[PDB]
Design a protein around this ligand. Structure first.
Ligand code: L4Q
Ligand code: NA
Ligand code: NA
Ligand code: ZN
Length: 257
């Protein structure tokens, strides 16, 4: 099956997922000079006060922090979006070294990691129906740079020892995702896709301009996770990012002047 190694990584995905060569694939390089400020874009409305985290799972590709998406608790609205998108999970992509790891790039700059908060459009009723639509998902992307520690990330870091290998999960209740945001909600937006198989073209991407800082020790602990299952040869979970894809017939819009 698919992965991020030389024999199953991004250059191979198109064989089982031909949409990998589609017209609105993600991630992309954000050329800051040619992104055009759109004064009609609204401020992002991030309403996470009632978020109910449930569990953290090593899925063999990253770790997902999962939320209760049965009801309208944590939602994303505004910005480029029409209607209401419910938070279902977040996860990260990161590198083996601080100089790589993000999926989106900014003027070709790679960040050490990238956080994806995944939301589905409530008009479609369930996540599974949302991923059959071109406006089914909204992913809020946040870059991570290495510097000072992010206090709101430490609870995530300190559970990773308990989900080292593929298929392991742990309770992860009462986690507040507001602690992962930067100060500013200024963003770029464009239409794209999931960045892993099945690579479905359902995503309104909202990528925040301002990175969050995390410490070297925090990202080092991400890199101690394993892609493999328990009892299998150890393969460190690093470099679980897809490179930038062709922009094709798309424009990236900026929320800020
Ligand atoms: C038919 C089931 C599809 C599950 C898709 C799960 C998924 C969610 C978000 C992302 S990402 N990295 O674009 O945020 C990738 C994959
Ligand atoms: Na442009
Ligand atoms: Na419920
Ligand atoms: Zn992702």
């Amino acid at each position: 099956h698919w992965g991020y190694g030389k024999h199953n990584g991004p250059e191979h995905w198109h064989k089982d997922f031909p949409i990998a060569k589609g017209e609105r694939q993600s991630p992309v390089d954000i050329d800051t000079h040619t992104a055009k400020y759109d004064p009609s874009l609204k401020p992002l409305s991030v309403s996470y006060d009632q978020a109910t985290s449930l569990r953290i799972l090593n899925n063999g590709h990253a770790f997902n922090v999962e939320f209760d998406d049965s009801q309208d608790k944590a939602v994303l609205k505004g910005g480029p979006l029409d209607g209401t998108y419910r938070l279902i999970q977040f996860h990260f992509h990161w590198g083996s070294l601080d100089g790589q790891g993000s999926e989106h790039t900014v003027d070709k700059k790679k960040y050490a990691a990238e956080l994806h908060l995944v939301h589905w459009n409530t008009k479609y009723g369930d996540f599974g129906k949302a991923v059959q639509q071109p406006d089914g998902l909204a992913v809020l992307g946040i870059f991570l740079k290495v510097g000072s520690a992010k206090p709101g990330l430490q609870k995530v870091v300190d559970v990773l020892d308990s989900i080292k290998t593929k298929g392991k999960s742990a309770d992860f209740t009462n986690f507040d995702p507001r602690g992962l945001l930067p100060e500013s909600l200024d963003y770029w937006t464009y239409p794209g896709s999931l960045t892993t198989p099945p690579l479905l073209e359902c995503v309104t991407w909202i990528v925040l301009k301002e990175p969050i800082s995390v410490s070297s020790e925090q990202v080092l602990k991400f890199r101690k996770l394993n892609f493999n299952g328990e009892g299998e040869p150890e393969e460190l979970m690093v470099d679980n990012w897809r490179p930038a894809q062709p922009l094709k017939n798309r424009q990236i819009k900026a929320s800020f002047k």
